[PDB]
Amino acid sequence: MHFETVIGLEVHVELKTDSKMFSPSPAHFGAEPNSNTNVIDLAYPGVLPVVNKRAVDWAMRAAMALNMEIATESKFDRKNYFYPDNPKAYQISQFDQPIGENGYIDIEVDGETKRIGITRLHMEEDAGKSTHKGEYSLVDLNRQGTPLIEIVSEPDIRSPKEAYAYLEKLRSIIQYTGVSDVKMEEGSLRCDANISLRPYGQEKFGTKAELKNLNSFNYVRKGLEYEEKRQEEELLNGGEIGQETRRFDESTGKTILMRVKEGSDDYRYFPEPDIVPLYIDDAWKERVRQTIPELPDERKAKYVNELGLPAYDAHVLTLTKEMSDFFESTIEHGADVKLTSNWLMGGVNEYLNKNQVELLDTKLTPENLAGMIKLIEDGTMSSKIAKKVFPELAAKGGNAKQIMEDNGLVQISDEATLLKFVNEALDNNEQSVEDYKNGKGKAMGFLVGQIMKASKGQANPQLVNQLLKQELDKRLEHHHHH
C-alpha cells in the first residue's frame, strides 16, 4: 500500500545569555559538579523565579526571524513532573501563550522550494544532569535552569531528507540571530523527531513514534529513515498501533523501544503565579525587530540575482552569518567575486574543518584574503603556490605578497627577465650550447637546470623551455677564441 510519511520535529535551542532563565546564577559553568547553583536552582523551600530580560528579547528575536506572529500577552506555565534533574518537580515553560506562533521556513530538497510551517516557539528552563554509576545515579544541577527555547514545527515534513533540510535551514537562521551557537555536538541544538505513516485513501495512522537520542543532523535523517521503514513493515504486517517512544542507536542505526505510551503524559499545566504576565508592546517588538540582520534566504537571493553567483555558491556562503559577512567584506575590497566564493567554499572551509577553528578565530581578514585573491587573479600567484600561502595567512595573518616573496615563492614569467636568465645560461655554458647543436646528450635539460639554479627555482618551467629552445635554434652558428 502507499502511505504518507508525516514528520514533526521538536527542537530545543540553548540561549547563550550570561545568567540562567529564572535564576541569577551563571548560564555557563565549569567542571566541578554543583558549583554553578544557588537556592533557586536547588529548588529550596520558599524560593521564587525571576525571569531573564535578555532571554525574552532573544526569544522574540528568534521567533521574528522565523516569521512568527509575536504575542502581545504572554505568560509562563508550570509543567509538572517528578525527576532528579528537575528539582522543583516542575519545569517553568509556556503552554497556551507562547512568545511566537505560526511561523515558517523554506527548504530545498528536489526542484522547487517547500514551505514548512512552524507552530510555535516558547521559553523554558533546561534540566540538570544525571549520570549513572552502578545501581545509582548522580545528579549535577549546574545546568538546571539554563535558558531554552522550544521550536515545534507543524507536522509538514514528508521525508527524512526534508527533516534534514528543515534542520539545516532552521540552524542557519537561528545562528544569524546570535542568540545561540546552535551546535548539536555541544547540545546547544537538540531535536526529537515524531513520525507516523498514513496509508493513502483514508485518514487513520499507523503506530506513532517519538524518536530520542538523535544527536546530529545525520543521525536525525538516519533515525527517521530507519523508523520510516520499520513503520512501513509494521503497516504491511498489520502490527499493533500505538504511541511509542524509541531511542536511536548510533552503533547500529536502529531505534529501540523505550516505552509504549498508554494514554498521555499528564503535566498538570497551569499558569505560573510567581511570574507576572508579559505585555509585549509595539515599541518593544520594534526595538527587537531592529536587531535582526539580513537572514540567509534574503542574502542568497542577492548573491544569485545581483552577483550572478550559482545557487550552490549562494547557499554555502550564507550558511553562517560570519561566512556571509566575510564574503561580502572581501568582495568589497576589490577581490573577484567568483574567486572569493571558491576560496571560501573550498580552501577556507576546508582549513576551518581541519583545525576545528571558527573563521573569526583565525588571522584571516577580508583584507589579506582579498589581497591573496588579487595575486591569483592577475597571475602573480598560481593555485599550487596559493595552497602554500593561504594556510600561513590563515594561521599567522600578514599579507600574501609578503609571505610569497619572504619565502622565495615568486614565479618569474615575464619574457624580459626570463631572457636575461637564458642569455646568462648560454654565455656561461658554451660547451653545452654546442653539445645541443651536435646533440651530444641532454643539453636542453642541462641548460634549463642552470636557469632553475640561477633563478632559485622561480623561472617558469614551460616558458623557460620554450624561450630556451627558440634562442638555441636561432644559433646554429659558431666561433673560436684562445
Partner 1 sequence: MSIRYESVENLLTLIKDKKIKPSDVVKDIYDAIEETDPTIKSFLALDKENAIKKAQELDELQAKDQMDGKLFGIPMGIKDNIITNGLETTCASKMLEGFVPIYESTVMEKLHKENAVLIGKLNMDEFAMGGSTETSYFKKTVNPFDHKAVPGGSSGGSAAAVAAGLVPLSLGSDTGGSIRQPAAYCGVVGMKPTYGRVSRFGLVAFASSLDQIGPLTRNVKDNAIVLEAISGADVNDSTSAPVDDVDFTSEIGKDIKGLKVALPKEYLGEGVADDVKEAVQNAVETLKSLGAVVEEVSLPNTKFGIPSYYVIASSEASSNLSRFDGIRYGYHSKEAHSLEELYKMSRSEGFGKEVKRRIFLGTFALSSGYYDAYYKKSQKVRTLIKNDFDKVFENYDVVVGPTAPTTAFNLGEEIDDPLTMYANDLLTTPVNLAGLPGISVPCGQSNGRPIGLQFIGKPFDEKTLYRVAYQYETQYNLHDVYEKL
Partner 2 sequence: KVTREEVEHIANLARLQISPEETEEMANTLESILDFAKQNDSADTEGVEPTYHVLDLQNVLREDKAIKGIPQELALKNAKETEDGQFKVPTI
One residue of 136, 264, 384, 438 binding partner 2 per CB under 8 A: 136
In whole angstroms, the minimum distance from the beta carbon of 94 to partner 1 comes to 16
Q: Does 150 bind Mg ion (CB under 5 A)?
A: yes
The Cα–Cα gap between 482 and 116 comes to 91
One residue of 260, 276, 311, 360 binding partner 2 per CB under 8 A: 276
In whole angstroms, the minimum distance from the beta carbon of 375 to partner 2 comes to 46
Q: Does 200 bind partner 2 (CB under 8 A)?
A: no
Binding partner of residue 90 among partner 1, partner 2, Mg ion, none, CB cut-off 5 to 8 Å per kind: partner 1
DSSP 419-466: HHHHHHHHHH-HHHHHHHHTT-S-HHHHHHHHHHHHTTS-B-HHHHHH
Question: In degrees to the nearest 10, what's the CA dihedral of 468, 470, 474, 477?
Answer: 30
Helix (H) or strand (E) holding 418, with range, is: helix 415-428
Count other Cβ atoms within 10 Å, centred on residue 320: 17
Which spans in 208-355 are helix H?
A: 217-237, 282-289, 296-305, 311-317, 321-331, 337-343, 349-354
Helix (H) or strand (E) holding 377, with range, is: helix 366-378
One residue of 7, 9, 13, 55 binding partner 2 per CB under 8 A: 55
In whole angstroms, the minimum distance from the beta carbon of 272 to partner 2 comes to 9
Interface with partner 1 in residues 72-91 (CB under 8 A): 78, 80, 82, 84, 87-90
One residue of 6, 12, 26, 258 binding partner 2 per CB under 8 A: 26
One residue of 10, 43, 54, 398 binding partner 2 per CB under 8 A: 54
Binding partner of residue 395 among Mg ion, partner 2, partner 1, none, CB cut-off 5 to 8 Å per kind: none
In whole angstroms, the minimum distance from the beta carbon of 77 to partner 2 comes to 9
The Cα–Cα gap between 303 and 328 comes to 10
Q: Does 77 bind Mg ion (CB under 5 A)?
A: no
> What residues contact 91, with CB distance under 8 A and at least 6 apart?
78, 79, 81, 124, 125, 127
CB 71 within 8 A of CB 97: yes
CA distances from residue 127 to 83, 96, 282, 335, 375 in whole angstroms, order as listed = 9, 21, 33, 48, 54
CB 175 within 8 A of CB 166: no
248, β-bridge pairs? 255
Q: Does 320 bind partner 1 (CB under 8 A)?
A: no
One residue of 274, 358, 414, 473 binding partner 1 per CB under 8 A: 274
**Nearer to Mg ion among residue 193 and residue 404 (C-beta):** 193
Interface with partner 1 in residues 341-370 (CB under 8 A): none
Question: What are the cell numbers at 379?
Answer: 597571475
Count other Cβ atoms within 10 Å, centred on residue 150: 18
The Cα–Cα gap between 161 and 108 comes to 10
Q: Which residue is nearest to Mg ion (CB)?
A: 150
Residue range at the interface with partner 1 (CB under 8 A); choices 111-119, 161-169, 217-225, 271-279? 271-279
Question: What are the cell numbers at 293?
Answer: 540582520
Q: Does 51 bind partner 1 (CB under 8 A)?
A: yes
Residue range at the interface with partner 1 (CB under 8 A); choices 39-47, 289-297, 346-354, 393-401? 39-47
The Cα–Cα gap between 331 and 369 comes to 10
In whole angstroms, the minimum distance from the beta carbon of 270 to Mg ion comes to 17
In whole angstroms, the minimum distance from the beta carbon of 77 to Mg ion comes to 12
**Nearer to partner 2 among residue 83 and residue 312 (C-beta):** 83
80, β-bridge pairs? 90
In whole angstroms, the minimum distance from the beta carbon of 119 to partner 1 comes to 21
Q: Does 14 bind Mg ion (CB under 5 A)?
A: no
Site residues (CB under 8 A) for partner 2? 17-19, 24-27, 29, 32-39, 41-42, 50-56, 75, 82-84, 89, 130-142, 266, 268, 271, 273, 275-279
Residue ranges that bind partner 1, judged by CB under 8 A: 39, 42-51, 78, 80, 82, 84, 87-90, 137, 139, 264, 266, 268, 270, 273-276
Binding residues (CB under 5 A) for Mg ion: these are 150
